Amino acid sequence: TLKPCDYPDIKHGGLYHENMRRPYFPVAVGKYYSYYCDEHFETPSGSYWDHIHCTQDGWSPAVPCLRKCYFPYLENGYNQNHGRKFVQGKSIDVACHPGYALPKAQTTVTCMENGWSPTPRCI
Amino acid sequence: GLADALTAPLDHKDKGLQSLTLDQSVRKNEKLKLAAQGAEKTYGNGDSLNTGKLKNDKVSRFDFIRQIEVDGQLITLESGEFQVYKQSHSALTAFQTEQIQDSEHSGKMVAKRQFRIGDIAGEHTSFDKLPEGGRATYRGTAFGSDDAGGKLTYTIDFAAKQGNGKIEHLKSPELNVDLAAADIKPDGKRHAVISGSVLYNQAAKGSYSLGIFGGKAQEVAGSAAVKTVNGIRHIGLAAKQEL
């Protein structure tokens, strides 16, 4: 016998129609529900919404809301990546203008759950 | 009267449902700008939508723009058609996307078509104020992407506190599903809600959620999700009893 799924605790998001869905949990394996992601967070498909599925191994996707970082404009830096979108965990190099640099001798930035780490700024 | 819904304020003389709170239609720090018949208004998570000016038992259509504040500037996320279905004690919203933001570049819009159900609101029927017995038959509309011609039939046995229905006449055959027997349960605020399985050719294709609306349980409103050969499809559901 397969383990039913309890209410999903979608971190950095939640389920749509929460009020109507909640009284019917735990749900059988095979059941799926439309969910959303909060501001700055995206679904594995790149949208703000998708469907979470109750499988044998539990809720799929396991990480329903991943952070999305939009590369900022650098006042005194090269803007080849200006406005580019990056998924949580991906790394990018910051090319600053001569005489400018990322504080405390840094060059690479990474998209974390909190956002860009460190903050991409030249001097 | 689409323009009045955006410009004119709330008036008690207008036909119900008069107001609709945009919660599932607009996320907390995002903006939804609606435009129709020369009119233009921005919302607003928790902001009210003047449904009173719209026509009952019909789909009201508006042009939408969804935006997010990125570095103190409002950047477009998605755009298309915003649909509103009105009834006397209930109303529901839907989004038909035509353009979305590129996966790799923000500020670059790409043509993608997604249909999703927004809000399902109204004068909720209390689970503790439902009729003790009798059978009620609900008749109304079922609507998906590029189709508002579906006809919904739902039946509730108040003694058993159980419901069952059927969807018919939708262009996509896989969407003409059966709404399996499901128990009416109380909500967190103790509102009468129904949720069960969706079947096509006696196979489970998804779930359906309905809310009972009106003092004397006059209406039902909600949505359904159906698995088809080409993907998961959403259907807006709204039905009423004989007036």
Author numbering:
A (entry chain A): 321 to 443
B (entry chain D): 80 to 322
Paper text:
Factor H binding protein (fHbp) is a 27 kDa surface lipoprotein consisting of two β-barrels that promotes resistance against complement mediated lysis and is a key meningococcal antigen that elicits SBAs. We have shown previously that fH CCP 6 and 7 (fH67) are necessary for high affinity interactions with V1 fHbp, and that these two CCPs are sufficient to inhibit binding of full length fH to fHbp. Here we characterised members of the three variant families by identifying amino acids that are critical for fH binding and through structural analysis, to inform future vaccine design and to understand the basis of the interaction of fHbp with fH. Here we show that even though V1, 2 and V3 fHbps exhibit remarkably conserved atomic structures, differences in key amino acids necessary for interactions with fH are only revealed by functional studies.
To determine whether these modifications affect the overall structure of fHbp and thence fH binding, we determined the atomic structure of fHbpDM in complex with fH67. Although substitution of Glu283 or Glu304 individually (fHbpE283A and fHbpE304A, respectively) results in a loss of detectable fH binding by far Western, neither residue alone accounts for the profound reduction in affinity observed with fHbpDM, probably because both residues form independent salt bridges with fH and are therefore both critical for binding. Characterisation of the two Glu residues in V1 fHbp that form salt bridges with fH, and their equivalent residues in V2 and V3 proteins (i.e. Thr304) indicated that these residues make independent contributions to high affinity fH binding and that different variant family proteins engage fH in distinct ways. Taken together, our results show modification of V1 fHbp at Glu283 and/or Glu304 does not affect the structure or immunogenicity of the protein, even though these residues contribute significantly to interactions with fH67. Previous work suggests that the immunogenicity of fHbpDM is impaired compared with V1 fHbp. However we found that the structure of this protein is unchanged except for the loss of the side chains of Glu283/304, and that it retained its immunogenicity in both transgenic and non-transgenic mice. Immunisation of transgenic mice with the non-functional proteins, fHbpDM, fHbpI311A, and fHbpR106A elicited similar levels of anti-V1 fHbp antibodies as determined by ELISA, demonstrating that the non-functional fHbps retain their antigenicity. The non-functional proteins also elicited SBA titres (measured using human complement), that were similar as raised against the wild-type V1 fHbp.
